[PDB]
Design a protein around this nucleic acid. Structure first.
Lengths: 88, 173
RNA sequence: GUCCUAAGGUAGCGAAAUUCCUUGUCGGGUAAGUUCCGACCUGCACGAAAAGCGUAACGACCGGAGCGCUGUCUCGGCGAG
RNA sequence: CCGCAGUGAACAGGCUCUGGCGACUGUUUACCAAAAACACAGCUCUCUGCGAACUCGUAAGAGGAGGUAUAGGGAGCGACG
RNA sequence: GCGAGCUAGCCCUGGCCAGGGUGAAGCUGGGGUGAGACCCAGUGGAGGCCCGAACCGGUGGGGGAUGCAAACCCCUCGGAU
RNA sequence: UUCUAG
RNA sequence: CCGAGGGUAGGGCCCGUGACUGGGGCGAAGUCGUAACAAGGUAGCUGUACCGGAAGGUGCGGCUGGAUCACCUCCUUU
RNA sequence: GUGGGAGAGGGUGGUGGAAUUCCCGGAGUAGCGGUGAAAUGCGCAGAUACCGGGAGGAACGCCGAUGGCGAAGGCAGCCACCUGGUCCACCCGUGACGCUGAGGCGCGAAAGCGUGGGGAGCAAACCGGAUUAGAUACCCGGGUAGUCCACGCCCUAAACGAUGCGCGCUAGGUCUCUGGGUCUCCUGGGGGCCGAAGCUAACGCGUUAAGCGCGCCGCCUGGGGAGUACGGCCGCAAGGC
RNA sequence: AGCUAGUUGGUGGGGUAAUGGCCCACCAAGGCGACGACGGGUAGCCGGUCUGAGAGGAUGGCCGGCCACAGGGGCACUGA
C-alpha cells in the first residue's frame, strides 16, 4: 500500500511552492500514483471488477484535471506530462 | 533425444540445486539438470516449479521445500507428492508427468496412506519414500494434430487399428 | 375404448442406394425425362452409436444438368506413315 | 514496321451449374477392381497399480516398459457442428 | 526339413526429392485507452499446403492376346519435405 | 370438472 | 483519340412469382380439456432450461402489479 | 491536504465448527420410511435408532436486525494479503478545474454453452408410486444435466422504487445507523415510518417529491397481428440487438 | 456508412466571350461523410394558393418569374 511518508515525498516533489498540499500538481501526482499500483493490482487478481470500475472513474478524474491545465497554461502542461510521462 | 537418465535419489546430505529447464521428450516428463555438490549431475524428475536457479534436494532429515523428497515416514499429512516410492527403494513408484500425484491422505504405522493419483486408494509402507512438489506436465494434454496425423510424426504407432477387418484375425479379435 | 408385451420411436430425416404397388402423386427443368432436383410423405422394411440430420474444403470415387468445343454421331469422304 | 496470324515450332486446366457418400494428404486387394473399403487426427465405454493387464513361451524368458493412470493395453465410430 | 536376394513387415545404417508458387507463429516499427486487448504495415518464412521433372503410381481410354513380355508398349492421370 | 351468442 | 447506339459476361437495388409449407387475422359455430381473476382449486407473473394431444408443467434465478389470523418467533411502544 | 470513522463493497490465499450423505468397526432388535389415507421403496445377507471412527464437498445457524455496504446486478464463519467506494472535524491547499452525455467502452442475476476438475445435498428432464374420467402437473418414493471451482463465451429479466442524472427553493413530528460537538441537545451524511404547503384523473409522492425552478439525456404518442416477418450487426449454438 | 482515378490540388496548355479537371499532358496525392456523405425513394422550384384564432398544416393548373423538354438518344454547322 501507499505509505504516509511516501505520499508526502510526492507532495513535496511536485509542489512549486512550500505548502502546496492541494493543487493540479498534487492531484495528478496522487491520481497517477494511485493509477499505477491499482492497475498493477488488477493484472494479478484478474477479476476485481468493482475496484476496476472505481479505478476508471479515477482515470477520468485525472484527464479532466489535465484538461484544465492545458485549457489555461499548456506551457506547464508539457512540463507536467513529460515529468510524469502520460500520453501515447 | 532417444535416451533416459535419472529417477530415484538415495544419496543425500547432497546439495540439491535446480539444474535447469531441460523440458524433455521421452516420458511426458519435463526435467532439468539437477546440480549436486560434488558436481555429479542428473536429468531429474520434472515435478513442476523449483525455478531454474535450482536450490533444493531432500534428506533422511526433512525440508518439504516443495519438490524434494524423503521416505514416507518423513512426510506430512494432507500432502501432495509423486516420485511414487512404492516398495522400499524401488525408486519411483508411479506418477509420470501424471501431475496429480498422491496425497499422504493419512498414514498408519509402518504403513502410510496414499490417494491413488491414477484413481483409487490404499497404503505403502515404512521408510518408503516419495518427493512432493507437483509434476511439470503443462496439462500435457490436448493440442491439435490438425490437417495431418501427429501420430505418424508420432514415431509413435500408426500401429493403426481396424476391428472391422475382412477375416477373423488377431487375439480377442 | 381396450387385449397382450420388457418397454411398445422420441428429436432429425423420407419414395433416400433403407419405398417392389411405381415410369407413387404434385412441382421445376424439356419438343417430349420410368434417371435427376425440390416437396408430400399410406416409410412394402430409416432412426442416433456398424451413430442420426447437416457440413466449408477436399476426391483419377458415383450420379444429375448448361455454355465452350470437336467425325462420337447425321454414311463420311481424302490422306500420311 | 510487317504476316491469316507476334507463349509464332516444342513442351503446356475445358469451364460451369447440382446432388449423394466418405471429411480432408493418404493406404490397400502384386497380373482385372485405389472405392462410399481400412487408415485416421477426434470421441465413448473399458480391463490394469505394477514383479502390471493382454501376446508369443514346455517352466526359463522376452514383450510390455527402464512405461508407471495426462499412462499401458480391449474396443464400436471415425473432422467439426 | 526347406525359404523375406518373392513379398508384408519390423530393427540398424547411408543416400535421395530440378525448378517455382502460396504466404500462418514470430520479431521490427506505427496505431484512439491505464497498461492492454486488438488493428495495420514491414520483415518473415511454417504446411503430411498448391503448380509441376526426375522419382513413386499404375484409375480413364488405345494396342497387344501361339505378344517384345506369364503385365509389357501408347496416349492419359494421382503423389510431388 | 364443464354448461354459446344476442 | 473521345463518343449515340448494339453485343457477351459479371454483380448490385426492387416488383412479380411458385408445388409447398410456418404462423397470423376473420367466421354462426365445432371437439378436448382448465391454465388464469376469490389460495381459479398448485397464488400468479417472469429470464431461461428441459419435457407434455393442446391450454401448460417441473427445475435455477427472481418480481410482486401475491394476501389471510384459520398457525409459530416475538416485536414496537406507557 | 490532513486527522479520525464505518461497512455482508471487491478479489487472492487460508484456516473453523455445526450438520449432511456414503464408507470401516461396536452394540442391538423387527420393522422402517412415508401421506389427506396409502402405495411404490428399503430390511432376517439384521434396516430404522444409538455409540465410535473415517472421508468428502457444500453452505455458513445464534448473533442478525424493519440493520449494513455498493455504479447496477448484487454481497454475509473466522484469517491476513492487495484494493475500490464513501462519511464527520480542521478550514489549511488549487483555483471554476464544472453539470448531462448520441455512439462507444467496461460490468452485470440465474438459466445455458465451451473445455478442464469435482458431484455431499438439492434437482427440470426421465423413472416408478398415487391420482382422477383423464393425470404427461399438485402429493410421495428414486435419480441426471446443472447447482460447485478455474478459465473463456453469452448481457438477457416484474434488471423493481415498474419511476435519468445534477444543483438550488418550499413546515414539521418521529424511528435508527454512521461521523463530530458546550454529548437534557445541536450538528453533516445515511436509512424506515407519519404528515403543511403543493402536485394528481386516480391512488399516493411529500427536503429520500410523483411540489417549485434551471441544464443535458433516453423513452412516449390507439388495441391485436408484435415485439413478429424481412434486410443488417452479433453467438459454438439456445438465441440476442 | 461508408464515398472517390480526372478523383483533390498543382505546373504548364487546348478550348471557349472568357473562370474552371471544362477537355488533355506531366506531377503530388488529397478531396468527402452523421453539422447524414454514397445509394435508394420521389420531384418542376418560387411569387402566390387553400386552410388556420394562430404558430403551423396542405399546395404551387390558368397569370408571372427562373428552369426543363421537344416521339427516344446524341452531335455539329451557319451564326452577336
Amino acid at each position: 500500500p501507499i505509505t504516509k511518508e511516501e505520499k508526502q515525498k510526492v507532495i513535496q516533489e511536485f509542489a512549486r511552492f512550500p505548502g502546496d498540499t492541494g493543487s493540479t500538481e498534487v492531484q495528478v501526482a496522487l491520481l497517477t500514483l494511485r493509477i499505477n499500483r491499482l492497475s498493477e493490482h488488477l493484472k494479478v487478481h484478474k477479476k476485481d471488477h468493482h475496484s476496476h470500475r472505481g479505478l476508471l472513474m479515477m482515470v477520468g478524474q485525472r484527464r479532466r484535471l489535465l484538461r484544465y491545465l492545458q485549457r489555461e497554461d499548456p506551457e506547464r502542461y508539457r512540463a507536467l506530462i513529460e515529468k510524469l510521462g502520460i500520453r501515447g | 533425444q532417444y535416451r533416459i537418465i535419472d529417477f530415484k535419489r538415495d544419496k543425500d546430505g547432497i546439495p540439491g540445486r535446480v539444474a535447469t529447464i531441460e523440458y524433455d521428450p521421452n516420458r511426458s516428463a519435463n526435467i532439468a539438470l539437477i546440480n549436486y555438490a560434488d558436481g555429479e549431475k542428473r536429468y531429474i524428475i520434472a515435478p513442476k516449479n523449483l525455478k531454474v536457479g535450482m536450490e533444493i534436494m531432500s534428506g533422511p532429515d526433512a525440508d518439504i521445500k516443495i519438490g524434494n523428497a524423503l521416505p514416507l515416514e518423513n512426510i506430512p499429512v494432507g500432502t501432495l507428492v509423486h516420485n511414487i516410492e512404492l516398495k522400499p527403494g524401488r525408486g519411483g513408484q508411479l506418477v509420470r508427468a501424471a501431475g496429480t500425484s498422491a496425497q499422504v491422505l493419512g498414514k498408519e504405522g509402518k504403513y502410510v496412506i496414499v490417494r491413488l493419483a491414477s484413481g483409487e486408494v490404499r497404503m505403502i509402507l515404512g521408510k518408503c519414500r516419495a518427493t512432493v512438489g507437483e509434476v511439470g506436465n503443462g496439462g500435457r494434454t490436448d493440442k491439435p494434430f490438425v490437417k495431418a496425423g501427429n501420430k505418424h510424426h508420432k514415431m509413435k504407432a500408426p500401429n493403426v487399428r481396424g476391428v472391422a477387418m475382412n477375416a477373423v484375425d488377431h487375439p480377442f479379435g
